[PDB]
Amino acid sequence: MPSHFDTVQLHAGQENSRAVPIYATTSYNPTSNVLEERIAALEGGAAALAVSSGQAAQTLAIQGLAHTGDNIVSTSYLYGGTYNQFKISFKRFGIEARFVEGDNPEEFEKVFDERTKAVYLETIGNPKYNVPDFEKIVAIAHKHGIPVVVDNTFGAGGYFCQPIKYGADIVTHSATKWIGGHGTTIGGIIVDSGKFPWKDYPEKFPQFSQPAEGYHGTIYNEAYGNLAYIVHVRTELLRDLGPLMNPFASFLLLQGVETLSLRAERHGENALKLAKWLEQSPYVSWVSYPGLASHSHHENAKKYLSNGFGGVLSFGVKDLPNADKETDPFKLSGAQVVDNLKLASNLANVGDAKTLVIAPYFTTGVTKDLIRVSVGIEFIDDIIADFQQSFETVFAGQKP
Amino acid sequence: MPSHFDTVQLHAGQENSRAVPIYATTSYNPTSNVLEERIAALEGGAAALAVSSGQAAQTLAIQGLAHTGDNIVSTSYLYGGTYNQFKISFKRFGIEARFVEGDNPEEFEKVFDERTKAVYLETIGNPKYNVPDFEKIVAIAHKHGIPVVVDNTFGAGGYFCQPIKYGADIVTHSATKWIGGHGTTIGGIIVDSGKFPWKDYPEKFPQFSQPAEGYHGTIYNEAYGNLAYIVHVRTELLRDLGPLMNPFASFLLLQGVETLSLRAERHGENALKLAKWLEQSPYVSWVSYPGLASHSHHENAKKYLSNGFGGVLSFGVKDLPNADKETDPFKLSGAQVVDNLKLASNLANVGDAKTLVIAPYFTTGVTKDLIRVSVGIEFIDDIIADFQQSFETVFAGQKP
Amino acid sequence: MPSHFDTVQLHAGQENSRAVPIYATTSYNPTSNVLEERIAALEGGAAALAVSSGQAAQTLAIQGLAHTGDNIVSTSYLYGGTYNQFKISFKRFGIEARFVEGDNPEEFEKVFDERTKAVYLETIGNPKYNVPDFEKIVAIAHKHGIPVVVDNTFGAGGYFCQPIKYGADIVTHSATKWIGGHGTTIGGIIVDSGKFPWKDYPEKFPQFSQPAEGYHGTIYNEAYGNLAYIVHVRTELLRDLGPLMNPFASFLLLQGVETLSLRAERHGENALKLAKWLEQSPYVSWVSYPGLASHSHHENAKKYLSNGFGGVLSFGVKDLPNADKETDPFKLSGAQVVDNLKLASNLANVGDAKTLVIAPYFTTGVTKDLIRVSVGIEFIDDIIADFQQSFETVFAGQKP
Amino acid sequence: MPSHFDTVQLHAGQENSRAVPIYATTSYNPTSNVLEERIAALEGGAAALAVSSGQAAQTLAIQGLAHTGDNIVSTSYLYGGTYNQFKISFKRFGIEARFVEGDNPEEFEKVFDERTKAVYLETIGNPKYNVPDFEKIVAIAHKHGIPVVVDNTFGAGGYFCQPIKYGADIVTHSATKWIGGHGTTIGGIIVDSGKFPWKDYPEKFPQFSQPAEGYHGTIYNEAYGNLAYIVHVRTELLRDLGPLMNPFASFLLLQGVETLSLRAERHGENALKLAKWLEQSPYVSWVSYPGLASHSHHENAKKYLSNGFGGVLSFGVKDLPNADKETDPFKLSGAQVVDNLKLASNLANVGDAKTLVIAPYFTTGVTKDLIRVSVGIEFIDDIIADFQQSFETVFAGQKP
Numbered sequence A, B, C, D: 001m002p003s004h005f006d007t008v009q010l011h012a013g014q015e016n017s018r019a020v021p022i023y024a025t026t027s028y029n030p031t032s033n034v035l036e037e038r039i040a041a042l043e044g045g046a047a048a049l050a051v052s053s054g055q056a057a058q059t060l061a062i063q064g065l066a067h068t069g070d071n072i073v074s075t076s077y078l079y080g081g082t083y084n085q086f087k088i089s090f091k092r093f094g095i096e097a098r099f100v101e102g103d104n105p106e107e108f109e110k111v112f113d114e115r116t117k118a119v120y121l122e123t124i125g126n127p128k129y130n131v132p133d134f135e136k137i138v139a140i141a142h143k144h145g146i147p148v149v150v151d152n153t154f155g156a157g158g159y160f161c162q163p164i165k166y167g168a169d170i171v172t173h174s175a176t177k178w179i180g181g182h183g184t185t186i187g188g189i190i191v192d193s194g195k196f197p198w199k200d201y202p203e204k205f206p207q208f209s210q211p212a213e214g215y216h217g218t219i220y221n222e223a224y225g226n227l228a229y230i231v232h233v234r235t236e237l238l239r240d241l242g243p244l245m246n247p248f249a250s251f252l253l254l255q256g257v258e259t260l261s262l263r264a265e266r267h268g269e270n271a272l273k274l275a276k277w278l279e280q281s282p283y284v285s286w287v288s289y290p291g292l293a294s295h296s297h298h299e300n301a302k303k304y305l306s307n308g309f310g311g312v313l314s315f316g317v318k319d320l321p322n323a324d325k326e327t328d329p330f331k332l333s334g335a336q337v338v339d340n341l342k343l344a345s346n347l348a349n350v351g352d353a354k355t356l357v358i359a360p361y362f363t364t365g366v367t368k369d370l371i372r373v374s375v376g377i378e379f380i381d382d383i384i385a386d387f388q389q390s391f392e393t394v395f396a397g398q399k400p
């Protein structure tokens, strides 16, 4: 299970002061550059760009492809923060999001036209935890000269999945999650594979083909070759729109990256064990996790993930007797179970070293019985023991 | 000079640990909140929002007003980065920037239609340091139901000018400059006056009057009344597009604010004394600074600024013999003066406590003789002596 | 009023990235070195050393001179924490502190013996704010081959007093106070004049004259000449005993240093004005401030202080009716006034930009009527008004 | 391998903002408080104190036991910096360090007298990695009423050893090393088991028995019972002597602790494998690591360590021809091996996630051939391959 990734996450971008300085300066960012190269190296990309958040990394990524009058094609299985960004905020920019339920390859193609500037996927989709069929979707997007953008947040900076290996062109990360690993720092990363042939599609992507008025009349394809996309995103979009990552955030996230494979491995082993334990528990109706045999999209998971199946799972708790008669929400077995955990923390992030839970129906396909768990790196027996005592307290004196 | 500003910059938002904790967390920003409240109070606004840069402040401020198909109307006296942002970047979003030379208010009205969603000004415009006629431009924009957005970066956090006092609706700052004060930290702020009556223009500004699909069906005008703009910018745009200020940035900027009035006063007084001296120098051909009586906009400057005239001036250095015959740039007198400076630092920021100079034709009204100076809070005799010794070097073996 | 000091506090040690990096590194401090060189220049010293606290700066400074069996001679007008340090902690190290009273030099001579390794002064002593007669005490210490160590904390980093200019050998600072300026960061500085002739006293100070076994047999006097003291303190004491300043602290203190003269000037000016105003107040029995003619050591203050008289003052509030008939402490006017302050903050620090108060008799001569103010840089009229409204409340229904 | 240590390292001290705020304040440290409770829980201690560095932790730890005229008794197998501290700087304090070669209990006893205030040991001693016989040495120390102080730095925060379970009284750490884990942050920890019965030695330890003049006449043994040591060290020594830990360092170290078990396990496993590999190399003359069967102390090591044998090893490289005629020491083989390493970094720290090497003859038992290696958590094959390619280069064109 140890591999070269362990070396890369400590050395890529550090060429020759051993720790990298916080260049807290406006004027002459080396700290962000190390981070960028390291995540590039871990993803199997050519270059990367750091921005102030996951949401910013997704925003710039798409705005570097699509302009007013354009469209993008996305899975409907969206991290809920991405869904509003797409359907609502992007619409105010004249960018139309088109959603393909299920991920039959020919369903994608039926909404393609010449104004389609990206296909957008998530490595592990919220909230059915389906892994996309990267090869089929990439073949069909590339056939029509459309680049593929993948949110690989749940791939933990490349540890569980490197979608560039399966043909993805652009990868985005909420580094806020597993890359940082400690719930201290918000950040995003955009990674360019450097393999999408912009030159073949000068009319679809004029931003790389035509002199850039905003950058000394540079033709990005001529001046930067295969890095045209990421250079344009840096020199025009980041410059003009300004979601830059603070060097202190760059520093903290570099600290996390140094232990990424160790943390992620443990997150995955703990999540698979917790998911298996929940599934056999008499308190639980169902569990959703990509590493369970019972998972529908397990075939893709097995093919495209490695070293495990991600840090996150969902499960439903069985009802208290008199389930639907109870007029009060908070008194339902899901919210109760969350309120009685002592180890797990009730809050909305994922990718902390600490185990985190949320019961969606009660604050933020959301049923009342549903608990989402970002599984931490605590001792698995204490994690399980925490759920068990919560179940016990909630179903107090009353078989499961 | 001392005023209640001195008290506010230390106490607004810390009404109730004596220093403000850096809450480097993702999950449950309070440092950001103190900064926002403090800049709001100094500018006389109702509320504010901190974001990752000045560029982002301007981007979100406009994107909270204008959607694709809309237009905005702007002075053409723009900060370099605002120009490309407006001309090139906003165009990709379907927002048309209409530029209007001079500060005749009839030039503004000329280019209004009912899809005009903002008028945009700079308190002290670049590169000629023109202060606009706030009263007249506001009057005419408000007549047509159009809100006025003012980049008050050169007003130093409200110290040299509070555009809201003259009817501005929205104020944006590069907090990177004088607010921070030390060249360490990038950051932006948006300040809402809360005096623009969104309710009276339900169709020009649908984002405040129609149910927000991306925010639980809320009608911002109904739920948040006079704070509809700023709440929308926060809960929709900031959330979806993601240019968040890091808490370490919030923290350092808060430290700068606490001395803003002390610093800005000294920047003002030093700039004026440098300007007057350059105006008597045999080595100078012209000087541009709003507090000089010879400046074309000296009247507006006197009426809308107070406590001084800002920290930035430009001047032209006398030509050396063979100036147009000279083919090589670096031997032009401007580049040579900048090269021989010892105290001043050659870089592009403004608003550092250190004095900074740039000869924009020899790096980035961009004529060959032109030196721009952001005048620092060094002892004035040391700043002057620095220019003097360089002039002497550059022009040696001649007659001043 | 402005002087070269304003240039020095921005430029010294920044030799040739505009801001100084945070080198958060164990291995290869540069940030620290800038702070050191800058405070040395501000104090007219040859070199300096940064350490984790004012208490650490005092400890190492003394342990750089005195060993077990030795004594030092100190004013008894000690900041509270220095007294315990000296009388109690130093004793466990076999260093005996001898406390001399008043300013008279002859009393100094009487307790001097061949094992006296230092004389210790404070620039403004607690809590009577008496300034020492530097010239007489230095003359009589130097006659006996004894160096003078001065805690110049209340000197505000050289702004109000540079004791080295009156012959002091070694100056220490709690940089926690005026040097940082914001109550955020704890730190200490030791400054060496480089002017004490260690070579003339090889027996009194063997640590500079005998091969140092702890440092490869170096004789500090030969290898480092006039810097023997500070090099010995760095390379032996800091190394072995370990009170090192973290580079983040170094960074924040440097930011404060950049406005030192502006803050200190305002603190001094506001304290004098407050002091005068309290004196004429009929709620006030007495006022102690070095810049009042009423002060007993006024003449030392005017000879050795410049640009003002420090940031700190004490005063007595007149008794309420039933003065000695109150056996409840908290009903006395002193405590009542601090509780009804709205702008001032009640805590034990000095040197914050904000106004700080304490009634030491009701938590930390220390009489029942006494309030200690560290006067901030708020608008003076707001500070005064805060006292008045407090007075009026406490004395409501009763004459001044 | 995974255990409860994994939960404790995440949760101890964070009872109920999910991330710990950085309280950068001088006035009212909770960040340090979390780190102290955590390291105490990981060591099996009652309480702990954070200080500016490991050197400071060792200094205050001893100064809280021994006063002028006292002695302590110490292994001779000391980390370099400790030896100078003990032999030289402590002597200036009137504390005599009595060094006891070897690890026979009885040799400790022969230098005990009634002024012996500590026995000081190291978990893995330098420079030959000997583990002391804890049980035997604690029994003879405690028989004479002497507390045992253990530098457990190389125990990695309790992961490889918890000396308190073997009867140690006080444990110190350089948290600079594995606790922190990234070479970013300097710090120390003192841990008190709360088991040493101070009340039975009121004259050997008057600091806990006699009213404390430096702290309100308190008798630590009465007011604080079994926590008298750690409270006296905090409220008197830390307060007067001032080696405070900055909250930024607290925060960074807390982040490191959250991955301690995962890092330390990989360090231990990587060192053992590198050790074994070195043992099959034709370029190596000897290897020293506690986990090898050939190590002199292998039995103590097996008894008192667990989960591995620590992260550091040393070895000696064969000479190149003409050792003795070489007059440039950078042309010797140990130096050349270090110079040709690509992955390993040449510097003095240990306990970084990166592999570090030093050949101490060429910089800081120190012989020509010695390389010390702090083995990092890179992929072991990369680490081995680095040494191999280095040997291949240095000894190119030769017999092996």
Ligand SMILES: *Cc1c(COP(=O)(O)O)cnc(C)c1O
Pocket (backbone or CB within 6 Å): A053, A054, A055, A056, A079, A081, A082, A122, A151, A153, A154, A174, A175, A176, A177, A186, A187, A188, A350, B242
């Ligand atoms: C958290 C998250 C995001 C948004 O990231 P931020 O850094 O919080 O802006 C987007 N993608 C995935 C799948 C996420 O989990």
Ligand SMILES: *Cc1c(COP(=O)(O)O)cnc(C)c1O
Pocket (backbone or CB within 6 Å): A242, B053, B054, B055, B056, B079, B081, B082, B151, B153, B154, B173, B174, B175, B176, B177, B186, B187, B188, B350
């Ligand atoms: C610097 C500047 C900007 C841009 O702000 P950043 O914080 O550098 O993104 C905006 N307008 C003015 C006038 C500024 O000087």
Ligand SMILES: *Cc1c(COP(=O)(O)O)cnc(C)c1O
Pocket (backbone or CB within 6 Å): C053, C054, C055, C056, C079, C081, C082, C151, C153, C154, C174, C175, C176, C177, C186, C187, C188, C350, D242
């Ligand atoms: C605050 C103070 C000290 C102690 O400094 P710390 O940085 O608080 O350890 C010493 N001397 C003076 C006069 C003080 O004001």
Ligand SMILES: *Cc1c(COP(=O)(O)O)cnc(C)c1O
Pocket (backbone or CB within 6 Å): C242, D053, D054, D055, D056, D079, D081, D082, D151, D153, D154, D174, D175, D176, D177, D186, D187, D188, D350
């Ligand atoms: C590094 C170290 C120390 C000294 O700690 P610092 O944090 O460098 O002051 C002492 N003991 C051990 C064994 C060491 O490894």
